[PDB]
Amino acid sequence: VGKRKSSTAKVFVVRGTGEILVNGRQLNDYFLKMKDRESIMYPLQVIESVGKYNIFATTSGGGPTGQAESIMHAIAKALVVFNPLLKSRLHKAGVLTRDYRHVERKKPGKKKARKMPTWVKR
Amino acid sequence: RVTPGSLYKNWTNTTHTAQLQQTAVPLALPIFNFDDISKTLNKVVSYSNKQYKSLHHLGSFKKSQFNELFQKPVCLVREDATNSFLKKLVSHPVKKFIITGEPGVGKTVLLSQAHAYAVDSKQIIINISYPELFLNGRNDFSYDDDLKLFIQPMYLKKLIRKILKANDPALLKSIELSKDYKFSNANPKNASVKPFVTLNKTKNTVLDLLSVMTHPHNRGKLMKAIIDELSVQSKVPIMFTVDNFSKVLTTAYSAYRNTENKQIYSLDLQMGKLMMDIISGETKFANGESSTILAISGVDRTNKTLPVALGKIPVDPYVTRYHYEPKFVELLQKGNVTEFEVPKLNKQEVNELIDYYKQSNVLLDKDITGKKWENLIDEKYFLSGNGNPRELLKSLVLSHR
Amino acid sequence: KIKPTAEQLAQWEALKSVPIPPRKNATLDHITNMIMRHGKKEKAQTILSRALYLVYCQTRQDPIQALEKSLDELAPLMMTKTFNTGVAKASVIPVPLNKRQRNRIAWNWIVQSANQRVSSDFAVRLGEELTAIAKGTSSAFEKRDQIHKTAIAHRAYIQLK
Amino acid sequence: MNVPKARLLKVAELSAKIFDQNFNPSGIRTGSKILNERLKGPSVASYYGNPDILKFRHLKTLYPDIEFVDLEEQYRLSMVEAKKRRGKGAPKKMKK
Amino acid sequence: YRYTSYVGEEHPNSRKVVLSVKTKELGLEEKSLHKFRILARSRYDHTTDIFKMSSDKFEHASQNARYLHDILQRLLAESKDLTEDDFSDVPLDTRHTIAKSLRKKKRDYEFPEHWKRPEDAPKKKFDIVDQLLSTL
RNA sequence: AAACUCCAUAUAUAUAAUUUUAAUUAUAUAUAAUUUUAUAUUAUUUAAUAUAAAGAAAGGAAUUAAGACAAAUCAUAAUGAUCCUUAUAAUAUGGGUAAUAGACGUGCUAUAAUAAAAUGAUAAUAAAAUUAUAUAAAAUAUAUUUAAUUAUAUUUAAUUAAUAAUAUAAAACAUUUUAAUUUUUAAUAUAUUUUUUUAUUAUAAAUAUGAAUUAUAAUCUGAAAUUCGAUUAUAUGAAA
Numbered sequence A: 001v002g003k004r005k006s007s008t009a010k011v012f013v014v015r016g017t018g019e020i021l022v023n024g025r026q027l028n029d030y031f032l033k034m035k036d037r038e039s040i041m042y043p044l045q046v047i048e049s050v051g052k053y054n055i056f057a058t059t060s061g062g063g064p065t066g067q068a069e070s071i072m073h074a075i076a077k078a079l080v081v082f083n084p085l086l087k088s089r090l091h092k093a094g095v096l097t098r099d100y101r102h103v104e105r106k107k108p109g110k111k112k113a114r115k116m117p118t119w120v121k122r
Numbered sequence B: 001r002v003t004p005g006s007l008y009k010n011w012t013n014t015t016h017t018a019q020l021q022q023t024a025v026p027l028a029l030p031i032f033n034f035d036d037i038s039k040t041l042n043k044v045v046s047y048s049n050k051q052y053k054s055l056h057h058l059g060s061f062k063k064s065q066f067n068e069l070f071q072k073p074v075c076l077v078r079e080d081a082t083n084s085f086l087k088k089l090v091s092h093p094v095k096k097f098i099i100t101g102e103p104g105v106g107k108t109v110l111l112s113q114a115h116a117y118a119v120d121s122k123q124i125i126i127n128i129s130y131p132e133l134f135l136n137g138r139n140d141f142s143y144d145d146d147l148k149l150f151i152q153p154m155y156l157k158k159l160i161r162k163i164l165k166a167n168d169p170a171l172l173k174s175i176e177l178s179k180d181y182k183f184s185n186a187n188p189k190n191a192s193v194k195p196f197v198t199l200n201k202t203k204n205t206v207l208d209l210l211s212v213m214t215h216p217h218n219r220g221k222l223m224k225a226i227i228d229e230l231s232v233q234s235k236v237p238i239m240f241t242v243d244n245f246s247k248v249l250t251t252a253y254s255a256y257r258n259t260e261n262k263q264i265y266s267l268d269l270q271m272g273k274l275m276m277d278i279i280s281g282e283t284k285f286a287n288g289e290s291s292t293i294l295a296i297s298g299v300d301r302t303n304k305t306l307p308v309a310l311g312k313i314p315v316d317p318y319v320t321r322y323h324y325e326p327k328f329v330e331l332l333q334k335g336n337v338t339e340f341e342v343p344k345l346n347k348q349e350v351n352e353l354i355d356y357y358k359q360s361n362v363l364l365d366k367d368i369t370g371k372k373w374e375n376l377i378d379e380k381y382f383l384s385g386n387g388n389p390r391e392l393l394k395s396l397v398l399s400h401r
Numbered sequence C: 001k002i003k004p005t006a007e008q009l010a011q012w013e014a015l016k017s018v019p020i021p022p023r024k025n026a027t028l029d030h031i032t033n034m035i036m037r038h039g040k041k042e043k044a045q046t047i048l049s050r051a052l053y054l055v056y057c058q059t060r061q062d063p064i065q066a067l068e069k070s071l072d073e074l075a076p077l078m079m080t081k082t083f084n085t086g087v088a089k090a091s092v093i094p095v096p097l098n099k100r101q102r103n104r105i106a107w108n109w110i111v112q113s114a115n116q117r118v119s120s121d122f123a124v125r126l127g128e129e130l131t132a133i134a135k136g137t138s139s140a141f142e143k144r145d146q147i148h149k150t151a152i153a154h155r156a157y158i159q160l161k
Numbered sequence D: 001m002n003v004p005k006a007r008l009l010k011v012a013e014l015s016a017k018i019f020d021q022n023f024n025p026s027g028i029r030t031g032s033k034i035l036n037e038r039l040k041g042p043s044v045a046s047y048y049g050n051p052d053i054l055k056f057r058h059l060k061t062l063y064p065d066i067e068f069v070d071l072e073e074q075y076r077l078s079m080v081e082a083k084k085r086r087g088k089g090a091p092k093k094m095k096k
Numbered sequence E: 001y002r003y004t005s006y007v008g009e010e011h012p013n014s015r016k017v018v019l020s021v022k023t024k025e026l027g028l029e030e031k032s033l034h035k036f037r038i039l040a041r042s043r044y045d046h047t048t049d050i051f052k053m054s055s056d057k058f059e060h061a062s063q064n065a066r067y068l069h070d071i072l073q074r075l076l077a078e079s080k081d082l083t084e085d086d087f088s089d090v091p092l093d094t095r096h097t098i099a100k101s102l103r104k105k106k107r108d109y110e111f112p113e114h115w116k117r118p119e120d121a122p123k124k125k126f127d128i129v130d131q132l133l134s135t136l
Numbered sequence F: 001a002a003a004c005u006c007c008a009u010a011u012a013u014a015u016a017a018u019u020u021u022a023a024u025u026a027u028a029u030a031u032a033a034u035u036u037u038a039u040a041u042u043a044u045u046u047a048a049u050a051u052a053a054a055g056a057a058a059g060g061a062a063u064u065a066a067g068a069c070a071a072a073u074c075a076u077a078a079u080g081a082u083c084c085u086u087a088u089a090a091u092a093u094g095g096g097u098a099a100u101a102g103a104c105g106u107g108c109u110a111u112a113a114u115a116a117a118a119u120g121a122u123a124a125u126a127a128a129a130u131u132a133u134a135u136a137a138a139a140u141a142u143a144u145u146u147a148a149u150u151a152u153a154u155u156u157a158a159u160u161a162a163u164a165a166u167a168u169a170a171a172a173c174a175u176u177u178u179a180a181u182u183u184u185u186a187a188u189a190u191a192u193u194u195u196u197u198u199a200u201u202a203u204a205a206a207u208a209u210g211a212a213u214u215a216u217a218a219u220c221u222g223a224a225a226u227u228c229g230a231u232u233a234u235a236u237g238a239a240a
C-alpha cells in the first residue's frame, strides 16, 4: 500500500509477464498523461524488471498524478519483497521514500495557505 | 502577411497537410497481398501502388495518424487482428462487420487493409470516411419530392467523384445498366443544345452514369440510381464501408432544420437513410463477396445503442433517446452485424514495429544508444498500456519528456 | 538469518554495474516548466513535444539533441550584471551563468522569435523557430554576440580576477 | 421511453392509492407544500430558555429559615441610597 | 420492523419505524411479485431484492409501525388481485437504483485468476525443534 | 525561547461477524528523530562541506513575554462619574441605513487562438462538511419536437446518517468550432496530402471578444419585493 496527497494505492505485484491493470482497467485508459505512466514504470525501470512483473494496481482518493505516484510507491515496496538486496538501490533512486508533500490548510487571515490579502501602507 | 511556403495551420492540420513526408528515407518493404499473407504474416508491409491510389481516393489514410513519419502510409499484417478479420470476411455467409475496440487500437488501419484487399480482388469500394460531413450541417441540402427525404448535393457530388476515382474503370465499365435514366444536364458545354442527358439500358455503362453532371436537385436522384445499379449487378463485388460509424449511431438527429424550426432526423436524410438501408437486409447486393464493413471511432460519443445492438447488454427500455436509440438497434439486428474486436498488440508485434521505426530512423537517440533492446521494448509495451499502437507511437516519437 | 537465494544474488550483481536511470531529461523539463503557466504542465508538455516532432519532420535527426545544441550555441556564457557600486557610477561586471540561467536566456529569445511566425498554434510557431535555429538563422544569435561584445568591454572590472 | 405513457400514469396512480401520497398528473399548484411543512413554532418559542426557573425571590418561599443575601440587589440599593444622599437621586415621576 | 430509541433525550426520530423485507421471501406468485415491485417503485431496490419503507407521520412509534404494516398488507392485496390489472407489460424501472449506485463508489474489479502463481508462493520451511516439541 | 500539545506521516497492537464497508478504511493505545553512523577535504579534540549506508522520515497549526502606543472597543457585556425620567425610557405604521459631483482603498469580470466556446451515460479522477427551526432522490409537466442540457413547477423515495440526500467534482484529456485573417469559403476541374492538395474564377481598429446598461414577460422566497432582493427567457450589447 502506497500513499501520496489524498491518494491510496494497494498494489498486487506478481511474477507473470509484464502487464498492467490500474483499478480494473487498462493502463493507457486510466492514466492519460504519459508522465504518470512513466512514473509508475520507474520502480521497474531502476531494476531491469519491467516486463518481468505483472502488476494489478487498485487506487482510491486524490487525483490522477497523485494516484499514479502512490501506485509507483506501492510497486517499489512490493518489489522490495521479491529481492531484498535491491532495496537500497530503490531507496537511492527515490522510490522507497513516501512523498510527504501535504496540502497546507487555509489559515484565517490569509486568502490561501500563504497568499495574504493586499497590504496598504497609506 | 503569409507566403505559400510558410506553415499557417494548427499542428494536427499542419502534420496532415504540409508534406513533411518529403524528407524521409525510401524503404524497400514487402507488398500487402492477401494471397501471399503466409510470406508476410507478422511483418511491416508497404501497400501496392494501385492500392495506395485507390486508398487515398477513398479516404483511408487520416490526419491524426502518424503517416507523416514515412515515405508513404504503412501497416503491418497481424495474425490475431487483420488476417483473422480477412479470413472471416472471406468465409462468412453474411459478410457484414463492425470493427470495435479501444481508442487508437487500429480500426482505421484495419479498414484500409480491407479496402486494399478488395482492390486486389477486383471489387468496387464505396467508402464513407467521416459521416460527420453529411450528418452535421455544413453543406447545402434540399427536400426532394420524388424521394421522400432530404438530399445533400455538395457532399453527394464529392462521394460520387471518390467512387469514380478510387475504383479502376475496367472493372466499373464491365457493368451494363438495368434501366434507362434521364437526368438534367449541367456541363459548361452543350447547356442550350442538350437540356437533358439520357443513359440507355444495354449501350450505356455504370462509369458513364457516374460521370453524369446534373443540377443539385437531380444529384440525389442520380445517387439513388447508381446505388440501385450496383445492387442489381452480379458481375463485381461491392465493398461498402463507413468509418466513424459511432458518430452516426449517436448523432441520431442532424443539425439541419426543416421549414418549421426543428432538427431533421438522420433517417429523413438521403445519405444516412441510404447507409442504414445498405447496413440492413434491404438494399441487398446481387453478388456474393459484397460486404459492409463499419468502424467505430474513439473520437466520437459513446452510449447504450451500439452495445444493445450487439450481444453485450440487455435492453433497458427506460434510458433516454439521447443515450439509447432503439430504431438504429433494430436496423442493426435486421442486417446480421457480427462485431469484430480489434485486439491490442502482442510483445513480438510491438518489437517488430519498434525495429521498423528504427530502420526508418524515427527512434530518438536516448532510446537507441546506451540501452538494451529487450528492456526498451518492455518499457514501450508498458507505456502503451500493453500494446495500444497509437499510444506506443506517441511514447516513441511525441514524448520528449 | 537472511538467506538470499542464488538467482537473486546474481540479479543483484548484474544490477550493481548499471547506474540508476534518470527520471527526466533536465533541460527539457526546465523548458516545459518555463512554457507552463497555471499549473497546466500537461499542455506545456504537449506543446513542446509537438514542436520537437515538427522539427524532426522538417530535418530528420534527433530533435532533443538539436534543441540542446541550439541552447548551447545561443546561451550567453556570461552577463554584464549592473551594480550600484557604493553610491557612485553603476560599474557593470561580467558574471558567469548557471546552466539553467544560460538556457533560460536562450529560451525567451527563442519564444520571441517564434511569436513573429504566422500560425495560430504556438506549438507550430515554436517548432518552425527551432528548425530555423538548427539550420542556423536568428536575431537571437545577434543578441548573444552583442552581449558577448559588451562583456568583453569591462575586462578587468571582474573583482577576484 | 418505448413503454407507453398512459400505462405508466395508471401505475403511478395505483402506487399513490396504495400509499397515502397524492397523485397530481396535471402538475397544478395544489398548495400541498404549505400545509405539509412541519410547523416549527415550539422550538422557536423555546429559544431564550425555561421562564419558570428558580430566582432569588423563591434562593424566601422555599427556605424561610435561611436569611439569604442577593448581593447585586444590595449593591444597587446602596448605590441608590448614595445618589439620594448627594442630591443625584431620580426625579419624582409625573402621573397626570 | 426496526425501531429506534434515544435513551436520555426525547428526540423526534424515536417515532421513526422502518419496515424492510426481501421481496422473494414474501409469499407471492411470480406475476403478483412483479406487480408488487412495480407498485413499490423507488422503495424496491433490484440489486438486493429488498423493499423497505419508513413512516414518521404519526406521533408515536407503535402507531407508525401499525401504519407501515397496514400499507404492506394493502400492497400485498393489490399484488394478489390480478382481475383486469396484471402489469405484465410495464418493465421494472431501475433509474433510482442506478442513481444511487452512481452516487456511491464501486470496487467490482478483482485480481485476474490466470495471473496467480501458486508455485512462486513461499513453501513451509522445516522447523526441527518445533517438530520435536510436538509430541501430542 | 526550546520542549511537551494538535494536524499530518511511518510502524505495531486492539476492534469492525468485510451488508452502516471505505479494511485501499476508521479510532483508541503505543513506538519513531530537535535523526544516526563512517570515509575524505578545508580550518582549528571539534565544525562546515562532499561522498557513502541506515532509515517512511519532509511540513503545517496553536502558543506572539515584559513594557510601550492615554493604539482599538462604554455599539458583545458589565461598572465608575455624569446627564435624561410624559422622556435621552416604551410600542406600532411607513421612510432611511442602498442618497451621488469629484476622490480613496479592497475585490469581480473582462479586453480571444501557449485560449475561449459545443459535446463526452458500461457516467475519468477528490477531499472536507451539512441535513428534526431539515437535506430533498427518482419520475412527470412547461420553457423547447424529438432528448439531453439548464431553469422552474408537480411530489416526497430515502436518512435525521460511516447506512439516504446535498453531489455523475472541475480543470484534465479527445473531437468540433472560432472573427480579426483572400491565413477562409464555393463553382468548376485536379490527384499516390481526399476530415485534404493544386489551378482559375468569385468571395471588399470591438467580433461569432466582453457583458455594463436598459425594455418586456415569466418564476422564487416571504404576509409584503415601490423605494430595496434572487433566478429564467426574449431582446438590448457601454467601456475595455
Ligand SMILES: Nc1nc2c(ncn2[C@@H]2O[C@H](COP(=O)(O)OP(=O)(O)O)[C@@H](O)[C@H]2O)c(=O)[nH]1
Residues within 6 Å of the ligand: B064, B065, B066, B074, B075, B076, B081, B101, B102, B103, B104, B105, B106, B107, B108, B109, B110, B296, B297, B298, B299, B389, B390, B393
Ligand atoms: N493495426 C495497426 N495500427 C496501426 C499501425 N500503425 C499505426 N497504427 C495506429 O492505428 C491507429 C488508428 O486507430 P483508430 O482505431 O482509428 O483510432 P480511433 O479513430 O480513435 O478509433 C492510428 O492512430 C495509428 O497510429 C499498424 O501497423 N497496425
Ligand SMILES: [Mg+2]
Residues within 6 Å of the ligand: B107, B108, B243, B244, B296, B297, B298, B299
Ligand atoms: Mg477513427
Ligand SMILES: [Mg+2]
Residues within 6 Å of the ligand: F018, F021
Ligand atoms: Mg470493503
Ligand SMILES: [Mg+2]
Residues within 6 Å of the ligand: F063
Ligand atoms: Mg513555544
Ligand SMILES: [Mg+2]
Residues within 6 Å of the ligand: F065, F066
Ligand atoms: Mg507584550
Ligand SMILES: [Mg+2]
Residues within 6 Å of the ligand: F070
Ligand atoms: Mg486607550
Ligand SMILES: [Mg+2]
Residues within 6 Å of the ligand: F070
Ligand atoms: Mg485614546
Ligand SMILES: [Mg+2]
Residues within 6 Å of the ligand: F074
Ligand atoms: Mg459608563
Ligand SMILES: [Mg+2]
Residues within 6 Å of the ligand: none
Ligand atoms: Mg459611543
Ligand SMILES: [Mg+2]
Residues within 6 Å of the ligand: none
Ligand atoms: Mg449596555
Ligand SMILES: [Mg+2]
Residues within 6 Å of the ligand: none
Ligand atoms: Mg423614546
Ligand SMILES: [Mg+2]
Residues within 6 Å of the ligand: none
Ligand atoms: Mg453600508
Ligand SMILES: [Mg+2]
Residues within 6 Å of the ligand: F112, F115, F116
Ligand atoms: Mg477568450
Ligand SMILES: [Mg+2]
Residues within 6 Å of the ligand: none
Ligand atoms: Mg465526468
Ligand SMILES: [Mg+2]
Residues within 6 Å of the ligand: none
Ligand atoms: Mg432530480
Ligand SMILES: [Mg+2]
Residues within 6 Å of the ligand: F164
Ligand atoms: Mg451516502
